[PDB]
Amino acid sequence: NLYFQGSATASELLLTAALERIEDTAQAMLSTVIDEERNPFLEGAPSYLPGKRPTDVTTFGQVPALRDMLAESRDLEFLQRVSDMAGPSPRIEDPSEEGLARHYTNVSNWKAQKSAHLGIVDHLGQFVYHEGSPLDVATLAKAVQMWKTRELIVHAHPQDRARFPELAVHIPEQV
Numbered sequence: 700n701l702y703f704q705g706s707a708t709a710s711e712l713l714l715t716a717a718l719e720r721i722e723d724t725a726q727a728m729l730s731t732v733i734d735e736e737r738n739p740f741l742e743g744a745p746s747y748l749p750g751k752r753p754t755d756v757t758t759f760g761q762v763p764a765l766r767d768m769l770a771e772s773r774d775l776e777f778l779q780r781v782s783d784m785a786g787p788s789p790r791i792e793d794p795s796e797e798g799l800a801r802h803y804t805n806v807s808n809w810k811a812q813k814s815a816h817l818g819i820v821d822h823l824g825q826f827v828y829h830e831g832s833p834l835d836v837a838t839l840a841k842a843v844q845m846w847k848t849r850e851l852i853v854h855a856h857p858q859d860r861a862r863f864p865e866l867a868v869h870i871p872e873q874v
């Protein structure tokens with residue numbers, strides 16, 4: 700309306716082959732974690748299930764890729780990029796039901812982007828995910844989320860690749 704200026708979000712205008720590949724891979728990893736109940740962060744994608752998992756791997760800290768991303772998620776430069784992508788807190792564009800509807804969506808999306816990583820905190824300000832975190836469906840799904848997040852950051856800012864190195868991911872010869 701007249702005295703209302705909506706908040707805009709950062710975007711990749713085109714679905715380039717690079718971006719599609721990030722998406723397709725992220726999806727495969729999610730499939731690996733949730734469908735296959737396997738860990739795409741270790742060579743051969745071993746199970747994470749008690750009874751099937753590697754005897755000596757039961758926590759985030761015992762998986763190098765996850766120990767790495769845990770540290771990145773505490774990094775100010777990473778968190779800055781997440782804020783840059785998510786943008787500022789959403790501001791309603793129009794004081795109307797349609798405006799409010801769009802605002803709802805903007806707020807959901809913003810929250811979604813802000814917390815798509817392993818460095819988020821609980822209601823007491825403590826990190827939800829740490830080196831002692833179990834490898835399970837929820838924790839690994841979050842790790843895959845962060846994998847996508849860091850790859851989207853690097854696509855947008857290629858020079859950030861040096862800071863957030865490529866990590867090997869392992870998709871079952873099935874998926």
Ligand SMILES: [Cl-]
Pocket residue numbers: 789790791
């Ligand atoms: Cl507002």
